[PDB]
Amino acid sequence: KGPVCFSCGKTGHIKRDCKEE
- Residues forming the site for Zn ion (CB under 5 A): 5, 7-8, 18
Nearer to Zn ion, 8 or 16 (CB): 8
DSSP, res 18: T
Q: Name residues whose C-beta falls within 8 Å of residue 12's C-beta, 6 or more positions apart in sequence.
A: 2, 3, 5
Please, what is the minimum distance in Å from the beta carbon of residue 18 to Zn ion?
3
Report the nearest approach of Zn ion to the CB of residue 19 (Å).
Answer: 7
Cβ proximity of 16 and 9 under 8 Å: no
Q: Give the shortest CB-20-to-Zn ion separation in angstroms.
A: 10
